[PDB]
Symmetry: C2
Subunit: 248 residues, 2 copies
């Protein structure tokens, strides 16, 4: 059931502490929010999970593999959606081909077509990715990420730049994917609790490279807890199965 286990891991660079005493367990079916301000160390933590950067201390177990092993193998278990990857594609590539590249035969092409249906992008399968909105491109990237049959889908601020309609479209797709793939784990990295859907039930609060709280979203996301987290008076409400947060 366990996919990723970090036990009291640390990350240092040039004498500076980047991450400190992080313990994190990600199991099949888990839907996690990774939350923190800009500068909190979220990206460094993702670099550890994706095996781009090593922990300097603690123990890292990625899908049964520990350093001391190959990063390439670890990454075959992970579907990673980030802004850097959206830019590796060129205007003139067809959507279907961009998805295919996430894996060529009739079954691989069929797998790409089914995933496009799941992300609501079937009508634009033959289109040049150049013609798509940012929202549409992010959904294509999600289908591409799922092609390599991963055990964890990691979304690094996937709703950045999206308006309300585009954001909710993407969020609804994640709810759909979770229905089709119950055992798929997801990590959704964000600065805005307004993006947290009922599907995402677990949260890790990251501040200055440290895990402050982790557990159930419903227990952790409170005015009291977020006020402590920020050291500023904030109000949190759950209303219509979504969260809002007001600075007071």
């Amino acid at each position: 059931h366990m996919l990723i286990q970090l036990d009291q891991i640390g990350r240092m660079k040039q004498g500076k502490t980047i991450l400190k005493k992080i313990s994190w367990q990600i199991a099949k079916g888990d839907k996690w929010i990774l939350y923190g301000l800009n500068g909190a160390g979220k990206t460094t933590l993702l670099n550890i999970l994706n095996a781009y950067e090593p922990a300097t201390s603690g123990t890292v177990n990625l899908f049964g593999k520990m350093p001391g092993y190959s990063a390439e193998t670890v990454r075959q278990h992970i579907g990673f959606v980030s802004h850097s990857l959206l830019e590796k594609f060129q205007e003139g590539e067809r959507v279907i081909d961009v998805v295919i590249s996430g894996a060529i035969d009739d079954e691989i092409r069929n797998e790409a077509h089914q995933l496009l249906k799941l992300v609501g992008m079937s009508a634009k399968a033959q289109q040049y990715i150049g013609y798509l909105s940012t929202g549409e491109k992010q959904r294509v990237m999600i289908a591409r990420a799922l092609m390599g049959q991963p055990q964890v889908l990691i979304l690094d601020e996937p709703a950045a730049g999206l308006d309300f309609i585009a954001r909710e479209s993407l969020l609804s797709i994640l709810d759909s994917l979770s229905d089709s793939y119950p055992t798929l784990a997801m990590i959704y990295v964000t600065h805005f609790i307004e993006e947290i859907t009922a599907n995402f039930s677990k949260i890790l609060l990251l501040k200055d490279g440290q895990s402050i709280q982790q557990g159930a979203v419903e227990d952790i996301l409170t005015s009291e807890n977020m006020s402590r987290f920020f050291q500023k008076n904030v109000a949190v409400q759950r209303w219509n199965n979504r969260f809002s947060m007001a600075m007071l």
Copy 2:
């Protein structure tokens, strides 16, 4: 005049296509406006008309008592009345420029380049830095600043020469919760400090609308769908009709929340 900008049924067409259609909009001293719409709604094109970067193709435009192309009309003169904060503006500044010097350059729009920067002008820049919470970093290279801090410096710069309108083009883009709230708190402070200053806050998130912003224009596909009091317009029923999708809106702790249903 208390009347700053008057657009009467303006249109904008480009290469045979309708970009903006039938926009009427009156901005008066002290007005604090939200300009709200999805990506692609035409918000930037509308800002271009207000800033005299692009002309209207129909209707009438009155920008600070000047109409194209009557006596005294000049795009440059229109812009002297406007403080404009936008992403394109920020990164024309280089990392090695001092914060104080960057704010000082806001004056040159209204005074030209010959006039000596005196104690009165430096006084003005330093006072504006205080207002935006950036005094401590006056002597710092703008390159060492956070995105949120950079935005605050741009606001200070925009307010040099006492514009009549402050226009903020999606100023919270890329900011985390604390940086966003710091920016919004500054705008609230500026509104109390300068109650006659009109402001236009362009956004696609209702969560960014503070209590001091009391008026809103809803833009969809180049058209003004509704405009009026935020309390009246930001409701579940109105926003559901705007999107053609079932949404719920609430005002809670002097801020708005909106949930997809």
